[PDB]
Design a protein around this ligand. Structure first.
Ligand SMILES: CCCCCCCCO[C@@H]1O[C@H](CO)[C@@H](O)[C@H](O)[C@H]1O
Ligand SMILES: CCCCCCCCO[C@@H]1O[C@H](CO)[C@@H](O)[C@H](O)[C@H]1O
Ligand SMILES: CCCCCCCCO[C@@H]1O[C@H](CO)[C@@H](O)[C@H](O)[C@H]1O
Ligand SMILES: CCCCCCCCO[C@@H]1O[C@H](CO)[C@@H](O)[C@H](O)[C@H]1O
Lengths: 432, 432
């Protein structure tokens, strides 16, 4: 049975923000999911600016439009989950009344879905006030609109929902599966989690937050096998890799960060880069570089020589196909789920890891497709500072002024199983 | 002495449209010119939506902003004409009062410029009403605004200018050089044209219009020297070039065009393509293909052999450098000025010409830079239908279902005077 997630909440209460994070997380871990924003449907259908009057409960024209947009969205939810192979559909709309919630629930019931409600409730002044500014500066609804006039207007639109608003009740809704989030990341009320997927959605939802912070991602400094153009293994740092560690410590200091937590893997290269900082670090094997199996410590030249078929097939689909006894990037994403979860929970954090591990992490926060993920650029001696925002997540690349080898291998043009070694190794950086 | 063109007129009276055409025409014929839209300066400075109230004569805040934007624009006019080498500056603003007009005139006088006024006055209902719709659908000022509210608002903004509006007078302004355009292309009043440049600006301005029509551009059908990969000459049509003429006649018919005027050059290939139509045509030598001088009828191979230096230098700057005894595209643009002027004056017109001639014409209507002009794509057996619009000019390419050779030669990567013949002729299409 597919799952219908029904958002619930007043306008500008983080309902859409949560809808996006949840869709992204579920897709990242391989659960085909799509969100359906009723407001966007309205925008696409009307194509003209609408004042708060359009949202009044007695406004017969705006009432019909919002009602047909909502039905259009639900038809699409049905198409996705019953025809397109979707597993989870996120219905993003205010859904503030019991009547409405019971209709959607019956929609799910008629289509053989399990329904689960996610209500977002803000009460924190700063959160609420900032959300309106975020809505006023980023919503397509309020473009080229006077500041005060837009604010006042949206303010009146929220009122249109507030008067008949009924939060999920402890008794009235005791037979419904749901989670109520009070001020994103602060408090929660959970009721009747029906299955494994709802259990994981709850676990994820109960661990995200909006506390201002930055995620610092960087690979260990240049290693020994790095200079040799060799992949995997357990090398130590190289002269330049040591030179980096010292630039990293200074960087971390100049940054003057509030309670920075540092993580590394069980590999000497990360650990020794961490050992150069002032602050303590924690090491985990879940953060270890992707396993190259039989191709561990080889150069690409050597891979082309002993495993030309696997090498060409990996180039064809670098996300799914693996070396014998190795891991695929798809395997790595799954291994990295507890890391994803903890990075969400953390505040200011620095992760000294590896190239493949770092690509998976960058793909998560920057929302890159599974196809592009294995090809993301994670240069040595560079710190990728990620700062989660309302729209998504900004990224700043900070080169820490130390020379290093290039380990980035572009996908070669010829990926034929019957290709010449010169064409298979054409996109390799200098090595030895 | 540089020239300051001062636009004058009510909002939505074609003032900006004329400002653009005039700047484009002057630049095309090689007179460095730039326009200065005071409304755009205001947009860039305020960066927030402004109602009609912002434009009220008693509104002390909007009065200061419009006044500093106007002075900023004039400072830039000064920088362009006195520091950047500009020849003509077009000051686009309502400039509806004598006081204002006299200030701008004194600005010109203090900076050693000759001032010339261009007033646009619409009275034709359909023109005026359509302009407001064009303004409402294309002005950045009215984005995401309610239709009726935007119209009403702009309507009130025009009122802000109408009450103190004083058109250029026959007696009051007898000492000023100017031209008053009443309903774009209908009537004109001209006073004291001071020099040659004002004389040409008047001549151009008195010949443009907004009567709905299309300009059909197409080269003669595939010729004999075309198949041989030979440039210039006076060949006749080839079997496919004849096959085209017949597709052209049918096209022109299926189009069912209102009083279509057809033009051709004094060359057999255009004339014979025209001879296949039902309608009469007129031939002019001003429409003759660019002169290749000593390289007439040669192939590129042959050019590389006898004139490798001129061939490499032409590839370096195809707009300005010419073959010995030949014309440059820059020479051709000038030769084509009477053609430009007449195409402006015409209504529905079809020009059966040549590749280089067609590039110059396409560059005019589509506003392409002099650098890009010699490289515009003008394929054989294809009709380029240009339709002048408010924003600029839309273009539709219509392939008339007849195979033909490719005569388009891209600029080769190596344009060194000391390059190998293989690298000079690398971008040549198949020929013989
Ligand atoms: C699945 C059925 C969806 C029906 C969508 C109805 C659209 C009408 O919009 C209504 O606006 C009211 C504002 O007070 C809210 O309280 C209602 O919950 C909302 O549905
Ligand atoms: C990027 C850094 C993220 C590191 C993720 C560490 C995940 C915790 O790893 C382990 O998970 C077990 C699961 O119950 C716990 O019982 C252990 O106490 C914990 O150490
Ligand atoms: C070169 C001097 C430019 C001065 C710009 C002043 C900007 C004030 O805007 C004024 O709005 C009025 C609306 O009734 C018009 O009549 C004035 O002509 C216009 O200047
Ligand atoms: C694209 C077709 C445009 C053709 C432009 C024809 C230009 C007119 O060409 C000639 O110009 C002379 C200039 O005074 C006139 O005296 C002649 O009568 C006219 O034939």
């Amino acid at each position: 049975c597919p799952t219908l997630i029904v958002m619930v909440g007043l306008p500008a209460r983080g309902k859409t923000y949560i809808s996006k994070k949840l869709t992204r997380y579920l897709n990242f871990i391989g659960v085909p999911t799509r969100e359906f924003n009723v407001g966007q449907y309205r925008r696409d259908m009307v194509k003209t600016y609408k004042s708060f009057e359009f949202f009044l409960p007695d406004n017969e024209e705006g009432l019909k439009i919002r009602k047909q947009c909502a039905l259009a969205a639900l038809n699409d939810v049905r198409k996705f989950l019953s025809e397109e192979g979707g597993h989870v559909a996120v219905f993003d709309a205010t859904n503030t009344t019991r009547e409405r919630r019971a209709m959607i629930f019956n929609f799910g019931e008629q289509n053989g879905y399990k329904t689960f409600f996610v209500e977002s409730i803000c009460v924190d002044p700063e959160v609420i006030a900032a959300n309106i500014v975020q809505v006023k500066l980023g919503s397509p609804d309020y473009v080229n609109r006077d500041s005060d006039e837009a604010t006042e207007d949206f303010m009146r639109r929220i009122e249109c929902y507030e008067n008949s608003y009924e939060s999920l009740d402890e008794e009235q809704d005791r037979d419904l599966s749901y989670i109520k989030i009070m001020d994103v990341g602060q408090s929660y009320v959970v009721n009747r989690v029906a299955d494994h997927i709802q259990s994981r959605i709850v676990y994820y939802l109960m661990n995200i937050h909006v506390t201002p912070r930055s995620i610092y991602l960087c690979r260990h400094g240049e290693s020994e096998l790095n200079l040799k153009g060799r992949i995997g293994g357990d090398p130590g740092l190289s002269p330049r890799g040591r030179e980096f560690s010292k630039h990293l410590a200074q960087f971390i200091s100049d940054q003057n960060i509030k309670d920075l937590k540092v993580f590394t893997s069980q590999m000497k290269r990360t650990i020794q880069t961490a050992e150069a900082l002032s602050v303590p670090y924690e090491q985990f094997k879940v953060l270890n570089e992707i396993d190259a199996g039989v191709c561990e410590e080889m150069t690409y030249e050597e891979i082309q020589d002993h495993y030309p078929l696997e090498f060409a097939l990996r180039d064809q689909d670098k996300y799914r196909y693996r070396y014998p006894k190795g891991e695929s990037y798809e395997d790595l994403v799954q291994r990295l789920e507890p890391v994803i979860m903890e990075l969400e929970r953390q505040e200011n954090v620095l992760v000294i890891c590896h190239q493949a591990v770092m690509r998976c992490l960058l793909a998560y926060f920057l929302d890159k497709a599974a196809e592009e993920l294995p090809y993301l650029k994670c240069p040595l001696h560079t710190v990728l500072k990620l700062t989660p925002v309302a729209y998504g997540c900004k990224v700043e690349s900070i080169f820490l002024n130390v020379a290093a080898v290039n380990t980035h291998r572009d996908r070669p043009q010829n990926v034929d199983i019957s290709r010449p070694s010169e064409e298979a190794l054409v996109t390799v950086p200098a090595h030895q």
